[PDB]
Design a protein around this ligand. Sequence first.
Ligand SMILES: CC(=O)N[C@@H]1[C@@H](O)[C@@H](O)[C@@H](CO)O[C@H]1O
Ligand SMILES: CC(=O)N[C@@H]1[C@@H](O)[C@@H](O)[C@@H](CO)O[C@H]1O
Ligand SMILES: *[C@@H]1O[C@H](CO)[C@@H](O)[C@H](O)[C@H]1NC(C)=O
Ligand SMILES: *[C@@H]1O[C@H](CO)[C@@H](O)[C@H](O)[C@H]1NC(C)=O
Ligand SMILES: *[C@@H]1O[C@H](CO)[C@@H](O)[C@H](O)[C@H]1NC(C)=O
Ligand SMILES: *[C@@H]1O[C@H](CO)[C@@H](O)[C@H](O)[C@H]1NC(C)=O
Ligand SMILES: [Ca+2]
Ligand SMILES: [Ca+2]
Lengths: 492, 493
Amino acid sequence: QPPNILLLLMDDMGWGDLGVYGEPSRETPNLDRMAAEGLLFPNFYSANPLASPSRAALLTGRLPIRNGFYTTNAHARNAYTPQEIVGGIPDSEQLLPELLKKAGYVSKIVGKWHLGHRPQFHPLKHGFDEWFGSPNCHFGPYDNKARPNIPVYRDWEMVGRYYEEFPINLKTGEANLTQIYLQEALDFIKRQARHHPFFLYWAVDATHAPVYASKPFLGTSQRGRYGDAVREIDDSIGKILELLQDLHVADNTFVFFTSDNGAALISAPEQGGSNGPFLCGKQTTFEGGMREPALAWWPGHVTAGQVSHQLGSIMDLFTTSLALAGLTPPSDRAIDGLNLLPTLLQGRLMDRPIFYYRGDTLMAATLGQHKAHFWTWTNSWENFRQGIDFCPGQNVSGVTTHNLEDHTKLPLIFHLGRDPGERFPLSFASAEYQEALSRITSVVQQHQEALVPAQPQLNVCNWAVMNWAPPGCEKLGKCLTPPESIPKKCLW
Amino acid sequence: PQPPNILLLLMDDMGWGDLGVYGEPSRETPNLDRMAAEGLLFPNFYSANPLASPSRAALLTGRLPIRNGFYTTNAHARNAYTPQEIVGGIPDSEQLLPELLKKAGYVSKIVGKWHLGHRPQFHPLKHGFDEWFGSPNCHFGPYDNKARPNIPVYRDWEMVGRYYEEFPINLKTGEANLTQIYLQEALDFIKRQARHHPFFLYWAVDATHAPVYASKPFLGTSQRGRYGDAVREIDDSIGKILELLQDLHVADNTFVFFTSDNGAALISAPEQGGSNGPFLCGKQTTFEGGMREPALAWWPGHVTAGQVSHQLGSIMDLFTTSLALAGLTPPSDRAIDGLNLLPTLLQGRLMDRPIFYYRGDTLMAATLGQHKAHFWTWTNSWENFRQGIDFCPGQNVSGVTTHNLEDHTKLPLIFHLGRDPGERFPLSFASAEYQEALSRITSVVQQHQEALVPAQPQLNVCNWAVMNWAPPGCEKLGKCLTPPESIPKKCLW
Ligand SMILES: CC(=O)N[C@@H]1[C@@H](O)[C@@H](O)[C@@H](CO)O[C@H]1O
Ligand SMILES: CC(=O)N[C@@H]1[C@@H](O)[C@@H](O)[C@@H](CO)O[C@H]1O
Ligand SMILES: *[C@@H]1O[C@H](CO)[C@@H](O)[C@H](O)[C@H]1NC(C)=O
Ligand SMILES: *[C@@H]1O[C@H](CO)[C@@H](O)[C@H](O)[C@H]1NC(C)=O
Ligand SMILES: *[C@@H]1O[C@H](CO)[C@@H](O)[C@H](O)[C@H]1NC(C)=O
Ligand SMILES: *[C@@H]1O[C@H](CO)[C@@H](O)[C@H](O)[C@H]1NC(C)=O
Ligand SMILES: [Ca+2]
Ligand SMILES: [Ca+2]
């Protein structure tokens, strides 16, 4: 029997949000015990600065440039899957649960999908057997004329909407959702143990603004509401882990914890996380935007309380989980995800690159201890003047710029070991600069010449495709009449 | 019945983010990380000043630099210390920790940097310590021995050489055998004292002070460049110091504490300076990154292993604690800032104390619970900033990180450290949370200030002629130099 796979994917949590990672308030005892009982990655990365493209990247093991989760409307624009998006995960893409099904797995997604809300993009059409969660954010409450409230699904059909059947109180921050997500996870694990190997994609989002937590966890954190959520998610994760041990299926269960992108610094200090020593956060390709916590837990297989400086990618969990199940990745396409079993079980290292993409643009690349910035950008001057700051309290001369700066000819290079916060660019005349530049450009060109970008899915929007009448609305009497609209270019 | 040994490990310019367990990315401190696992970690511990001298005086006196005299009044809120030319130093009126420990039968050794005065009257062996190996000053140089003399290294009463002479530091490569000698002094001392007398060891190393140094086997081993090389060596050294305690079965009767005298020296980063993790600025300022420090406590069988305490802790506390460990009481004829942390260390209790952040003659900021109020703000002057000196590289918080000494006494800048450790978002002045904190914090501040009679300042006068031209012992080595003709004058800070 192949080992169970449990993937814990957080939403907008940063490198500095875990106790073991150096959070001052030390409010994550369960994840801290998971680290003590496993392996911690200090140099792990997501595939994009925001949600959709990263989640697609996890599930495909492929860069958003490859899987289609980007825009070409303008260069280097962050795009995702809002209610009005026309595109979504293509049928050509082979998702992890589709393939695991080859080894007898039974797979469940809990929480946020974000790979398309239209019927053709349903996760049960793309490998998953069961679902409880929403295809979108939990933003609202909407007036149901201009926008409809975001639906929560059980499997094929909606069972309610956020701010309706599933209340979120914005004043207090109260919502029972994380407790339902917990309960879905426990029950699933209970039905599958000793029957079939299971795959659980536990993609919670209480940590996405507007932040929420159940009543018992409200006002317990020193981090305000955002920490309340983090404390609940942590408590929940402890209980998920204890159940694996109480069923003696822990030795045959591989669990991995990570986050889809950096902390949402527009929402700090109350509703956003911490990126620790790193620069900026979500929306950018600086370290704080794409470096993530990363714990691996597999009693008896992964040696307890170790550290690996393996450069890791969220995409690696695609290939690894396949290797865990004794399968091979698709041989008819480029696969970015690497098999990390040699790192996880033997403590070996691998000299791989980390590409930092923002929209249609490779912004930056990391080999070893060096990161080269070919393009730099926080947000435009117009957005900055309107009070949107992606890098609050932070300003690095000629690095954190409000123009999309072209450094393709003469990249801004950092030594991450010496300078994790990307504060001091290497001098252009130095030998260390030259050695890195050659090493990094070599891998980048190679990548780019072998790269045929996919057709972009995130270019077109249409008011009429919003969740007006999800499947199951008729029986609940919750279908809404949609407005009259045409498809047009999304304004990003 | 014998009182436990006390080992104090004091670092020089290391920051809150320089330890693995504290969240350093490269994870290069396995021994301190094992000391944490085997003890108690403090996330909310503080030094008493933004730089060396005043903090080290504060540790040893258990008293604020405003009280013990380690400050200047030449201008308001100026960082001052004890350079070679300083006239003052630790006053005779001050009762230092080793003086007092000697009341419980202790034998005390300082290893490394003193920095409480280099003149004969200020010698550590005149102030409680039985043995010394180290320098009274920095390891800056090499000086031409006409304008300035090279800084001496002492064994006990007499100099045994000078830096960049008998004790070479290579600036090109960063090589120096000093940390290995400091280690050896510590091991040997522990070996002679065990099963004889209870011992106090003040291990104040400084490889991590610019210009940074490490022994050959540790050079080029860190991903943090030379500064990390040092940090790796100090760590390895600390591992061996700990292993010796266990190999002599005196570890259960030995209380060890690790900390740093101030924040990372961000003018020297990225090659020669540390990391302050999530916090703002560093050394020279009273922002969190300047005065919040790592803090581990290790005492097998007494301090429960691998715990965390959010007790607001001060470097001064080690004065009162070490006394309490020895079954003694602090001086009752003077104000004592250091608190006894045995209830925190051995029982896990909490205590609602204030943290005062002084810069020179000015109380800049104060912290109670989760709130910090800035009464004054300042990084450095505009003139110094334009000359390339930046205390907060890559950091700028609007109307908080300012190049003028800003007066917020009427309307303090308040932060919630739990929510906003990097001091980025001041609380709104109209909020109830602001009002609650302001009253709570001003209450303790006034109380402190009304009971406060500042000491006369020791760091006001300098004199070229008092530099280490002819230290005791120079005559036999033939190393005495002729001093220049000068008068005492006001130090330019
Ligand atoms: C699921 C979700 O909320 N998606 C968010 C989107 O709503 C918005 O906040 C965006 C900011 O660019 O980031 C995405 O990750
Ligand atoms: C022992 C030592 O070097 N003292 C230093 C001093 O030399 C200088 O660097 C100063 C900067 O303000 O900081 C002090 O801690
Ligand atoms: C959560 O569930 C409890 C019942 O156990 C209920 O009292 C509470 O109102 C619920 N809160 C929300 C926001 O639905
Ligand atoms: C960032 O710093 C540079 C150089 O000090 C300066 O020109 C610019 O005004 C600063 N920008 C912001 C947004 O703070
Ligand atoms: C340091 O010590 C070793 C002997 O242990 C010696 O060979 C070496 O020359 C010394 N290095 C310096 C720079 O003094
Ligand atoms: C810091 O930020 C402020 C406000 O944005 C700006 O006016 C100033 O230029 C910055 N300070 C420096 C020294 O660059
Ligand atoms: Ca996200
Ligand atoms: Ca210092």
